[PDB]
Amino acid sequence: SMIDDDGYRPNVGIVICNRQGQVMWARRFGQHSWQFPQGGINPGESAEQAMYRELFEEVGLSRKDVRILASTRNWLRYKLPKRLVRWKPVCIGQKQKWFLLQLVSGDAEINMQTSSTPEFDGWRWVSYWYPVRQVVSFKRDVYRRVMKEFASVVMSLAA
Numbered sequence: 001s002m003i004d005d006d007g008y009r010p011n012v013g014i015v016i017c018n019r020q021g022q023v024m025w026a027r028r029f030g031q032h033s034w035q036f037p038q039g040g041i042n043p044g045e046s047a048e049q050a051m052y053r054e055l056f057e058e059v060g061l062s063r064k065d066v067r068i069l070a071s072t073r074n075w076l077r078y079k080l081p082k083r084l085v086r087w088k089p090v091c092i093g094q095k096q097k098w099f100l101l102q103l104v105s106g107d108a109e110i111n112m113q114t115s116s117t118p119e120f121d122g123w124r125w126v127s128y129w130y131p132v133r134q135v136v137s138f139k140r141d142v143y144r145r146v147m148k149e150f151a152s153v154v155m156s157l158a159a
């Protein structure tokens, strides 16, 4: 992704849910910190195209394995801790468009190991609200807003 005027790189985030009130939670490669899939937008790519590229490259899935249930409307931004800014044009954060997907294929279709440098080691199902308290603090405000925006849909499926 290319950094914009203000130092924010455009990215997409992905919340994948099932019908049990759960979302797909993934362990950052070589870490004990966990997060949702997120990926950059290449020039020319739409947000939806970037999302399906992230879905393929780091989750191993096709359009055909999911259905899009919702999308956030505007960019949601987080700023990197000043200690984590890699030095230009220097990136100070991300602006993100988020997607809620329902997994309709089997769990075994998920493959997080196809890249030579995976985003993730692997994943597990967690309860819907578990991500807000478990994600790194500088993303917590973005996560709280996304999970609130998506909450009605996931809970209705879970009934």
Ligand SMILES: Nc1ncnc2c1ncn2[C@@H]1O[C@H](COP(=O)(O)CP(=O)(O)OP(=O)(O)O)[C@@H](O)[C@H]1O
Pocket: 033, 034, 038, 039, 040, 080, 084, 094, 135, 136
């Ligand atoms: N949960 C976490 N705990 C500690 N550090 C984290 C973290 N999540 C992210 N970071 C740090 O924040 C930096 C920026 O992370 P992100 O904004 O998630 C993009 P990235 O993971 O570096 O991949 P990218 O190549 O797509 O940019 C990373 O170098 C990472 O070390």
